[PDB]
Design a protein around this ligand. Sequence first.
Ligand SMILES: *[C@@H]1O[C@H](CO)[C@@H](O)[C@H](O)[C@H]1NC(C)=O
Ligand SMILES: *[C@@H]1O[C@H](CO)[C@@H](O)[C@H](O)[C@H]1NC(C)=O
Ligand SMILES: *[C@@H]1O[C@H](CO)[C@@H](O)[C@H](O)[C@H]1NC(C)=O
Length: 740
Amino acid sequence: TLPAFLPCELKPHGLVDCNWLFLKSVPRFASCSNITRLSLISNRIHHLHNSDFVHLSNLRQLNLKWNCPPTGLSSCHMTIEPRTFLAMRTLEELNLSYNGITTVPRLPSSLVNLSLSHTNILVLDANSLAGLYSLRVLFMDGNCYYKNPCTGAVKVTPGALLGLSQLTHLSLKYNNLTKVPRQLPPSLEYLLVSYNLIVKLGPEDLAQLTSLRVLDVGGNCRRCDHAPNPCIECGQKSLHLHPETFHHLSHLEGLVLKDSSLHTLNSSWFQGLVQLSVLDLSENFLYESITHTNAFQNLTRLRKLNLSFNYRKKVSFARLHLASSFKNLVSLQELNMNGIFFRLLNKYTLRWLADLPKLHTLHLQMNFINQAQLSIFGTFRALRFVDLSDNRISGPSTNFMDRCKNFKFTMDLSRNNLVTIKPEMFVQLSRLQCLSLSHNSIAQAVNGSQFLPLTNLQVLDLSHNKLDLYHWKSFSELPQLQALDLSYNSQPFGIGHQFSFVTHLSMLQSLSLAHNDIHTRVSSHLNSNSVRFLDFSGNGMGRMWDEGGLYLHFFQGLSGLLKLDLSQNNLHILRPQNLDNLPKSLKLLSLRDNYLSFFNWTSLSFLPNLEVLDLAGNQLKALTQGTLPNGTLLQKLDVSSNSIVSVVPAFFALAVELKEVNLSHNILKTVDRSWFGPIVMQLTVLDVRSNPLHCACGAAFVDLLLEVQTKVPGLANGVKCGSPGQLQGRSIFAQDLRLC
Ligand SMILES: *[C@@H]1O[C@H](CO)[C@@H](O)[C@H](O)[C@H]1NC(C)=O
Ligand SMILES: *[C@@H]1O[C@H](CO)[C@@H](O)[C@H](O)[C@H]1NC(C)=O
Ligand SMILES: *[C@@H]1O[C@H](CO)[C@@H](O)[C@H](O)[C@H]1NC(C)=O
């Protein structure tokens, strides 16, 4: 009856999960000849042996990452006997990353993917990887840098990898290499050697690598000025690139040259790169270059271009004007221009991008833009996303609802300096479907005159501002508005009524008023025929309902409401009246993180369509009022993180549709079949983790949990005992509780 892979857990997909279990050896675990995938991430296995994997002879995939880290954390050296991995003749994937080994173990020729990253291997020679002729992917990053230091550098002897006749992917970052290793296999398709000390590159460093698809050589000549992490200052003032370096790479699709101290672009570098789809030139000194270079003239296939964090070569500079060669980038889909810095976004700034047929995404964060003629973005062919967040725009020139993914025309103006919204700032932006103005300082009585041009806007995020919301005409100029986020609206400083506008928003489906400053003149009714989701989290619904009749019907006029979030409202009680006067259409109610101690369960009949009820984080001390009533449609009940010590028999019994019950993080000493009846065997999840279960020998609860074992999350090791003393904090399977 016990889970077959105790103390580990079956993730049905053949994956035996033994991650994070403090194990010091490979578990031996009802046969194991059918397990093909084993994960042992972040245990404490420091020694591997000849017979450790004999019972796992059919493993295909094996992850031993982080068992014995170098330093690392807060010293460790892993020993590995000769035949250890030879036991697994069909092993295809092995991860030995983050382990203190100095030499690569002997390995079965069936291997295809191998990781040796973050180890202490400093030398790769021919003996290192015999005879891995089926190997396709090899990673060995980070064996010699600040987080994992070596004295010297890692050394890849010439031709050492030629025995890997099938190698397609090779990564050797952060290894202090001073040159690209010699005589690499011609089969290579991906080569990453970023963040070493390769200050010079030529056609001599990429010899016969004619099948290269992606090449990453960035971070080899760094400017360490203002670097978040320890950096090694390049000798030269720029990476040395011979102009014919990349010429023979006719299949190059991705090239990365970031953080290379480049000061000039040369058309030569790209002359052979004609399949080039992705190019990263970020963190260089190409400000001036991109204002005038001819380099982009033939980059006709380029889809993605990163120009972010490019600095100025000379203090004397002209206002940003992208080069005319940019007009040739007809395949361009995404352009990243974060962190370049320019005060001014005008009709010439991005002019040469305007006619590009496929340009959908424009990153413009962190540029300190304080003058923006946003109307230019109404003249582009195919824009879907423009990100102007984190700038200094303050007006016209002279979790989140913003999803919105991929499909809608979206602009992000969050984290700017907007104090007042003027309609003129939106001229020519009438196709916009999603807009964010969150985290500005908008202090304004909104009244239907702010957003006139936005006739198509569907999603509006105005969270974290300072809006007056008493005007019933608010947002009346947005006829297609479906989702509106006004969470975290404050009022640091007596007419109309707060939220009166809701009933006039004919298309509104989703509304957030969460965490709002709410004063005495709130509308006593929210009214709508269209709202299906209301988030009223973090307000004072407790004090409001304490007023008596006044707000007794606050949510009732929301006809058709399906989901209501009243979490964090400092509710201590919930009269039947308050429940009966929520809209009868309600399917989901969240009362998470309140102070409810008692809840008459039979009163759920006042909510006939309820399917999901969240009472987590309150202080129900027992499930005992109390029973789920005939004939509730409740499918899921979360009563986790309360202080439930007991449940009345038959509590869940009448809940014919019940599928999920979370009972975790309570103070239960047992879990009892009598609480449920036959309902227990239709449950899809039964969560009983973090309860002080009493692990006595006679303990009835084991039988129940084993019966529904497939349905209890973390059953194998994650369900612990509170008692007795020797089993405190230990798995309920640490001993055999069935023996009595
Ligand atoms: C990398 O090599 C350089 C050579 O100048 C040396 O300063 C450093 O010891 C190496 N880095 C580390 C700490 O691994
Ligand atoms: C692109 O190719 C043309 C010939 O097809 C060549 O004349 C031109 O100079 C190239 N562009 C640049 C600036 O390298
Ligand atoms: C049960 O509730 C707890 C809250 O602490 C959560 O961590 C856990 O993921 C929940 N289980 C399910 C099935 O969501």
